[PDB]
Design an enzyme around this catalytic site. Sequence first.
Site, PDB file in Angstrom:
ATOM      1  N   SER A 249      43.956  32.138  45.454  1.00  0.00           N
ATOM      2  CA  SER A 249      44.673  33.079  44.552  1.00  0.00           C
ATOM      3  C   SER A 249      46.195  32.960  44.697  1.00  0.00           C
ATOM      4  CB  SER A 249      44.214  34.505  44.768  1.00  0.00           C
ATOM      5  OG  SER A 249      42.892  34.698  44.308  1.00  0.00           O
ATOM      6  N   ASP A 273      36.886  42.589  31.186  1.00  0.00           N
ATOM      7  CA  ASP A 273      36.414  41.917  32.424  1.00  0.00           C
ATOM      8  C   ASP A 273      35.027  42.452  32.753  1.00  0.00           C
ATOM      9  OD1 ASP A 273      36.195  40.401  34.781  1.00  0.00           O
ATOM     10  OD2 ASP A 273      37.687  41.558  35.847  1.00  0.00           O
ATOM     11  N   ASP A 288      33.612  36.573  38.920  1.00  0.00           N
ATOM     12  CA  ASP A 288      34.842  37.215  39.438  1.00  0.00           C
ATOM     13  C   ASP A 288      34.577  37.539  40.910  1.00  0.00           C
ATOM     14  OD1 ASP A 288      37.273  38.696  39.690  1.00  0.00           O
ATOM     15  OD2 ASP A 288      37.151  39.274  37.594  1.00  0.00           O
ATOM     16  N   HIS A 294      37.232  44.200  36.730  1.00  0.00           N
ATOM     17  CA  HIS A 294      38.460  45.017  36.877  1.00  0.00           C
ATOM     18  C   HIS A 294      38.730  45.801  35.579  1.00  0.00           C
ATOM     19  CE1 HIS A 294      38.822  42.018  40.184  1.00  0.00           C
ATOM     20  NE2 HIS A 294      39.307  43.107  40.817  1.00  0.00           N
ATOM     21  N   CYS A 307      42.552  39.138  39.721  1.00  0.00           N
ATOM     22  CA  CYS A 307      41.387  39.064  38.806  1.00  0.00           C
ATOM     23  C   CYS A 307      41.106  37.601  38.459  1.00  0.00           C
ATOM     24  CB  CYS A 307      41.601  39.862  37.527  1.00  0.00           C
ATOM     25  SG  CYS A 307      40.193  39.668  36.456  1.00  0.00           S
TER      26      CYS A 307
HETATM   27 ZN    ZN Z   1      38.395  40.784  37.485  1.00  0.00          ZN
END
Ligand code: ZN
Length: 525
Positions: A249, A273, A288, A294, A307
């Site tokens: 990330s 999402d 995810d 999210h 996310c």
């Molecule tokens: Zn997410």
Amino acid sequence: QPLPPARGYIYDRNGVLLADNYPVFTATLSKADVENVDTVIEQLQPILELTQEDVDRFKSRIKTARKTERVAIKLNLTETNIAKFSEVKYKFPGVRIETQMTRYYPHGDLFAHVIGYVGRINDKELKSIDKDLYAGTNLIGKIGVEKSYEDLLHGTPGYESDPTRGNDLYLSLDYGLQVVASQQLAGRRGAIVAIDPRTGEILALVSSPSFNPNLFVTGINHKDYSSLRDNIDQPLYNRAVQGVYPPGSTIKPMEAMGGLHYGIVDWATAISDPGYFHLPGDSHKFRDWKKTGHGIVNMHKAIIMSCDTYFYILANQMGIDQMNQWMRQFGFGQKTGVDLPSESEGLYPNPEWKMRTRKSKWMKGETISVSIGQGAFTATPLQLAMATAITANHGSHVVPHVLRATHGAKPFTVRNAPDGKINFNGTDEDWVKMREAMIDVIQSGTGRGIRTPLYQIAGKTGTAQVLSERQLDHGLFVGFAPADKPEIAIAVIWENGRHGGSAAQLAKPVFDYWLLTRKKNPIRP
Ligand SMILES: [Zn+2]
């Protein structure tokens, strides 16, 4: 008569000595002073405790050497070698004990992975080297600054019937910051790189564990070397410069800027999402990190909550060819161009790479893996620091470099400034918005617990998939401070550190040292 030059010293940005020379006793013999040189060495073998290595090396040089040439037989003699030779001294006229300079690293382990070591000139090196320049020079750079700046450090030889000393290097690295960064990875595997985003100056570069480079200067015993090479924690390996990790990330803040650049998303563009993404017709559900999702996710939310869905959707629209072009502007996928040897390329995967390495076509599923810093995407901590510095300085390309100044007679050009600006189709505001998002990662996001009350840190956490310890996930943190006028960007890879929030814990003291401590109470030797 050659007079070999004194090797130049290596200092830090403040003038703290990191490599010098000290005098030792050395057994030489000259071709002018000795007839039947081959027999003489066989006699001196048990007297000086010479090994088959020490021997062969002498004959190698004495062939390719002049008369007034002082070819070393053993370097940095032990008190026993001095005594045993002294007893039979006048049974070898012309074989002298001479005062010559050895190399010393006053803070060996601390700067081993930056400065490296010199070692004895082997046979391969001899056949690539100007013999007249390296006439009577016994030591040459092997790795680190010592290799990468061999010529600048070496000097120019002179004669008698006047030699020029090697140039001194002042590194950009800071003694104090290097100490604090090293402390954080004490008894841990991983790497910490700090860069000045204004210049590309490396302020700290730590690969953990370290080693003593003084063991290599005048030969390393096959017992001591095999302990280091066969050690499981791999201390001779430079995790900062050669080591490559899935960035995870950590690469999302830059990929978001790619979104703004290509005009695909803006700050308001939101996504439903559901906790997954499916490719048209593809059955594979790309999940995810949080499988509930999210909710309604815009750019700011995608950054503070990491996310994966936002970035799967963004990357799918962007496509791998446009992700390559953009992400490579931050340093990913090719050598950063650091002034150290053996820098790894990393890998930003592309279709041409796939057609060479796996002889297969590119599948749109491989794009989705790369979007969250996984797939075949691998990055050096060097690369991750560079990318962070570029994010911090609003897209000015900097070349990571350790050399700050060189003082001496040899002319040299030293890089001190960014080499370019990314043409970015957004505005300066888009970098400011991404800074505030990255501040909020620390304030109210995935990097909570490393907050400071005196300055603002912008950052982004990540994890990476790899003996119940060694198979744990790596923690990654990238960030910079003070966020509004960046002075320092950090990349932490804690190997088997499980959470990026953990890796963030290691960065706070490095940031704190640089921005609070160093002005009042600087760590000095
Ligand atoms: Zn997410």
